[PDB]
C-alpha cells in the first residue's frame, strides 16, 4: 500500500547532471516498506520507502514555469 505518514526534505532540491530535479526525503511513518505518494513528471520508476531511517532519492522532470510528496504533506516549488 501507499505510505500514510509524513515526509521531510533531507536536502534542498537541486538540478542533476542529466537535467532532472533530485528530491531527498526522509520518512517518519511505521508502515515501511511502502509506496511514496507523488503528485505535481516522476522519473523514479517505483519510488518506495524501504526503511524509516534510510532517506530516499526521488527524481522528477519539472514542467516549464509545485510538487507534493505524501498525504502536513511535503510541498516543493521549482
Amino acid at each position: 500500500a501507499m505510505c500514510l505518514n509524513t515526509f521531510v526534505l533531507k536536502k534542498e532540491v537541486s538540478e542533476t547532471q542529466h537535467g532532472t530535479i533530485l528530491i531527498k526525503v526522509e520518512y517518519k511513518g511505521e508502515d515501511a516498506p511502502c509506496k511514496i505518494p507523488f503528485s505535481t513528471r516522476l522519473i523514479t520508476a517505483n519510488p518506495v520507502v524501504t526503511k524509516k531511517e534510510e532517506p530516499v532519492n526521488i527524481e522528477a522532470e519539472p514542467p516549464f514555469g509545485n510538487i507534493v510528496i505524501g498525504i502536513k504533506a511535503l510541498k516543493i516549488n521549482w
Epitope: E15, Q17, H18, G19, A45
Partner: antibody, heavy 117, light 108 residues
Framework: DVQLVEPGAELVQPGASVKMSCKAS????????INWEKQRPGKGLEWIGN????????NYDDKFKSKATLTIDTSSNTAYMQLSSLTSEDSAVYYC??????????WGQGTSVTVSS | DIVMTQSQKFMSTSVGDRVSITCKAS??????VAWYQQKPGQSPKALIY???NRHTGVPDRFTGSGSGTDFTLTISNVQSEDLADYFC?????????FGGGTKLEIKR
C-alpha cells in the same frame, strides 16, 4: 582544447588518506559537471559521484559515501577527491571526466593509487 | 540501482568484419546511454552519446543503436586499431552505472 589534468600516481599506506586533483582547462569550469570514476584491473568501472562547480552541488554514489569526499576550488579551476580509511580494495585508477547531458565526454589520464605497507 | 549488462566479456572478429556489442539495462533508460572505447594504458574515449549519436571525430564505422533496455554498439570493417575494451554507461538516473565491458579480440 578541453583538458582535465590529474597526477599520475599516489602511493599510500593502509589506514591513511589520499587527496587527488583534477585541474580543468580549455572551457568554463563553472558551466559543466565533473564526474569521478574508479577502475580496478579486470573490473567494472564505478561512478563515485559528481560535482557542479557553478552551484557547489555534490552527489555521491551511496556505495562511496563512507570513502570519498568531493570538493572544489573555482579560483584555480580544480576539483578534488579525497579517499579516506584506505585499504587494498582502494588500489585502483581514479578518473575525473567533464560531464553534462551527454554524460562523460573528456576524461583525465587517471590517478593510479597504490595502497600498500 | 540500474544494472547495465554486457554479457559478452570477449568478442573475436576477423579484420574487415562487422561486430555488434550488446548492452542490456535492468530497467528503461530511454536513450540515456553512452559508449566508450578504452585501449590498454589509456583513458576511455567517448564514441557514442544518447544511444545513437556519434561524437565529432569518431569514424563512421562506429554506430550506436537501441532505446529502452536493449543497446548495441556496431563496429563495421574491423581494423587492428579497434583492439580495445568497449563499455556502455547509463546516465538516466543516479547512480550512473557502467556495463562490465567487452574486450574486442582481432582474429588472424
Amino acid at each position: 582544447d578541453v583538458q582535465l589534468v590529474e597526477p599520475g600516481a599516489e602511493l599510500v599506506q593502509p589506514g591513511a588518506s589520499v587527496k587527488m586533483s583534477c585541474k580543468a582547462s580549455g572551457y568554463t569550469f563553472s558551466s559543466y559537471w565533473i564526474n569521478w570514476e574508479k577502475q580496478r584491473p579486470g573490473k567494472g568501472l564505478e561512478w563515485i559521484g559528481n560535482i557542479y562547480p557553478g552551484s557547489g552541488t555534490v552527489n555521491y554514489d551511496d556505495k562511496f559515501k563512507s570513502k570519498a569526499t568531493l570538493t572544489i576550488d573555482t579560483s584555480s579551476n580544480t576539483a578534488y577527491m579525497q579517499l579516506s580509511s584506505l585499504t587494498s580494495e582502494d588500489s585502483a585508477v581514479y578518473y575525473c571526466t567533464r560531464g553534462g547531458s551527454h554524460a562523460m565526454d573528456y576524461w583525465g589520464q587517471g590517478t593510479s593509487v597504490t595502497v600498500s605497507s | 540501482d540500474i544494472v547495465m549488462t554486457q554479457s559478452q566479456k570477449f568478442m573475436s572478429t576477423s579484420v574487415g568484419d562487422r561486430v555488434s556489442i550488446t548492452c542490456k539495462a535492468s530497467q528503461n533508460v530511454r536513450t540515456s546511454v553512452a559508449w566508450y572505447q578504452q585501449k590498454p594504458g589509456q583513458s576511455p574515449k567517448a564514441l557514442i552519446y544518447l544511444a545513437s549519436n556519434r561524437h565529432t571525430g569518431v569514424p563512421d564505422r562506429f554506430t550506436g543503436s537501441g532505446s529502452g533496455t536493449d543497446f548495441t554498439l556496431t563496429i563495421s570493417n574491423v581494423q587492428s586499431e579497434d583492439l580495445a575494451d568497449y563499455f556502455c554507461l547509463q546516465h538516466w538516473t543516479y547512480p550512473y552505472t557502467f556495463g562490465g565491458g567487452t574486450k574486442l579480440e582481432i582474429k588472424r
